[PDB]
Amino acid sequence: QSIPEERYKMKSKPLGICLIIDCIGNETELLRDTFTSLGYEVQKFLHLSMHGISQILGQFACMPEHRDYDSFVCVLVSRGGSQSVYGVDQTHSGLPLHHIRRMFMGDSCPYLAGKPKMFFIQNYVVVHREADFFWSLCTADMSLLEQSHSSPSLYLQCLSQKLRQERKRPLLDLHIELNGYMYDWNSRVSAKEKYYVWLQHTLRKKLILSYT
């Protein structure tokens, strides 16, 4: 008799929408290919302003289609602060991550109640209504973007490779190994080239991004 006792149902086709918001534009098709391979319907929006982000997230949170899907994923890439994202806007007070949470909570977003809501955020810096959320926040220095030959996020690329090759393993098991890899990469570079990875979640069941 193993734990967790239950497993999030993962049967719908598609498994859900994979909302990609890349305000920077350096990421490759890698992550989108991987999530499509997993069975997600990918929708991509590039270089959005904070307003654009609030507006696209708000919109997606009310998509009646969620009722037919078993999960939801959002990948967010943007310059930002400790716990917020600036989008392409030149500002110091971004859209706080907890507001993003508020938009998808059980009350606000009912069509996703009891369904796993996953957020993978690459930030570049200088039922209870709060259940079934999974937050992955990677923070790296903006100087990684100030290079003549900018490098795509090692975090997002590693996430894609793990999901592509080991999709039947629990997401958290995969992510802890991803963290180990980021730690190994970090052990080779100064702070302005490191990828720090922080996680927070309210999952109540086994979560595997593969058909149950």
Place this chain on the structure above:
Amino acid sequence: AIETD
């Protein structure tokens, strides 16, 4: 009685 913290 069930108390909150």
Place this chain on the structure above:
Amino acid sequence: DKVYQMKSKPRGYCLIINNHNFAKAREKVPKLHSIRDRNGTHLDAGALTTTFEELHFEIKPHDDCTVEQIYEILKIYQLMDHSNMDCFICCILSHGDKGIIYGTDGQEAPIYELTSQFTGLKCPSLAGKPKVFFIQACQGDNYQQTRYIPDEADFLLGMATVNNCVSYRNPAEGTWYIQSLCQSLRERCPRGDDILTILTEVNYEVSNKGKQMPQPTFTLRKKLVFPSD
């Protein structure tokens, strides 16, 4: 595919800050006048004590600590020599609010100020080793911003509830979160289950019994297990 080394005897210290008596939060701090003493927290402290002694940690209990005391205790552990230990655990049982915990004297201590005292730079003898915090407390008054820990690796914070909300304490049985946590560690560690998997199970048990939603926040980068004798 790695696991944090967890073989030393003891494994490390398990600090338990247990706050029961909130008289002053009514005798010296004007706004918490209706703040009730935490009846049942002693059962929690005892459960944590027996759970972790069985898992080979050296228990260091401290009861009724004002915020000043919490800081001095934490400072003493920050300066101690953990070089022969594989882990460090710090449990805090008290009243709380959005992102913070209350001292018995009604003063506040941001959770982030507590955990960040154990970064590799500040506590070298725990650098590369898991630093685990378990906090039973409310995080607001909602019933149904901080990121709690540093972004560097090896931190695990187990919170009884998401931010802005309350957590429940049954005066005769202990708190939902701590009692569930201890029961799962006791039953599941001997079976080889990792601590994060156990915390998801706790999220589930507690959320099934208003409703309460626990929440782990962490930067762990290896599987964490507490091998049980």
